[PDB]
Every structure is written in structure tokens, then in C-alpha cells.
Symmetry: C3
Subunit: 104 residues, 3 copies
């Protein structure tokens, strides 16, 4: 009988240990999920047809974008250095056009 | 003894409570993980060298993109208003070129 | 009494079953969270003002980008086919400018 009572005491202790484990394990996983929920970039809905970036009214800079292929129908994103290359050629054309005209 | 039996009854009840807690806590965390898994934008593999957006064959619009720096070697993404500014200058050049030629 | 002892034995077995459940359920959820943590595209901090893509020093290609609206102030990302269309018009202008000049 004093054996029964001791066995019950240990059972009670193990139940308490289990409750402590559940609470710590669940808190840990919820903490990790919460962190990701708050920092993941998300599609706006299940269509995945749009990502409205989360930076607010002044927007979100995306950077470390590798140069996209500039070819007909390419769906790769392009970056500021790619646009700068075009801008340089356009500025030359604008200048040359002005130079030709002012030569008259 | 009737004490032992009562203690056992309560132990049984607590075990059932614990099983109910585990099931609810795990369901909650799985629900939150599932939601994020389905709406997070993902890299295609562990290299992180590419994101193929999930909008299907007609693609994914990214919007609220802050103007990227247009400078040599910039890796910032650029947006449609930045391209529109270039397009405007190109259209002027095209027109002026046509005007110069038709002046002959 | 032999009833008490049997009830205790079953209680012990159920506690072990519960410990096995907790360990499997938690491992499963941690595995799914870990996978997402490693493949989700993330904002750099709580401002969400920037995403520095995770592809390393040579960057990350974003693809399957739907054509963005090219209009004044548009914050839609643009893609390589959109840039290619502009490049084509710029190359024409450059050529025509050279042709006009070499006609002299
Ligand atoms: Cl031009």
C-alpha cells in the first residue's frame, strides 16, 4: 500500500513534468512561427497573382537582384544597373540629336 | 483505499485533460504553419539563386516596389514609373529624329 | 488491490504513449517550420522597407514576373521583356542618328 502511494506520487510528478514539457515545446514552436509570420514576404491571396510589398505607403526596395535576361518576352526582373545602361544610351542619343539640330 | 481510488480517478481525468491540450495546441500551431506555407514567397532551392514566382503561367505582379537606385552596377529592382520616365525620353528622341528627317 | 495495481500499470502505459505523441507531434511541426524558415523570402527587418535577396554575392534572379504597368509613378516591378522593348526602340534611334550623320 505504501508502495501504491509512492507509485501514485511519482505518477503525479511525471504528469507535472509532462505539462511543463508541453508548455515549453509549444511556446518554442509558436515563437519560431511568429517570427517567420512577421518577416516572410507573402502573396496577397491564394491566386498568387500579386505581391503587394509590406513596406507601407513609401514602398519596399528589393535589392541583390541578379541581372535578368533582356530578351523578347523575358519574365525576369531587371535591376537599376540594367536601367542605367539603357539610360546612358538614351542620354547619348538625346545629346547627339541636340548637337545635330544646333548644327544648322 | 477509497482515497487511492479517488486519487486514481483524478489522475485519469488529468491525463484526459492533457490529451485534449496536446490536440488543441498542436492543431493551432499546424494551422498557423499551414497558412504561412501556403502564402510565403519562396526560393526555388537551397542555393537561393532564383525565385520563380508562384502565380502560374501568366505570372505574378510585384507592386509597392520603391524606386531602385539607377546607377552603374545597381542590384536594386526598378519599377514601372522608372521605366515610364525612360520611355518618355525615348519617345521624344524618336519624334525628334522623325522631325529632323521629314525636314528635308 | 490487484485492480489498483492493474489500473496503475495502464496509467503508466498511457503516460508513455503521451510522451511518444508529444515527441512525434513536436518533431513534425518543427520540421515543417524549419523547412519554411529556410526557403521563405524575408524582409530584412520589421520596417519592411527592404528585401536583400538571399542568393549571396552574385544575387538572386526573380522570374515569372508579370509585366508591370508602365505609367507615371507606377510601383509595379518590370521585367526583361519590357526592358527589351525599350532597348529595341533605343537601338533604332541610335542607328537612325548614325545614318543621318553619315549622310553628310
Ligand atoms: Cl533613345
Amino acid at each position: 500500500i505504501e508502495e501504491i502511494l509512492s507509485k501514485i506520487y511519482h505518477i503525479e510528478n511525471e504528469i507535472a513534468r509532462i505539462k511543463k514539457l508541453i508548455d515549453s515545446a509549444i511556446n518554442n514552436v509558436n515563437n519560431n512561427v511568429n517570427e517567420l509570420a512577421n518577416n516572410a514576404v507573402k502573396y496577397d491571396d491564394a491566386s498568387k497573382d500579386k505581391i503587394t510589398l509590406g513596406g507601407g505607403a513609401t514602398g519596399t526596395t528589393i535589392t541583390n537582384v541578379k541581372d535578368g535576361t533582356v530578351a523578347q518576352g523575358s519574365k525576369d526582373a531587371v535591376n537599376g544597373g540594367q536601367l542605367w545602361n539603357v539610360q546612358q544610351q538614351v542620354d547619348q542619343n538625346t545629346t547627339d540629336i541636340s548637337n545635330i539640330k544646333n548644327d544648322i
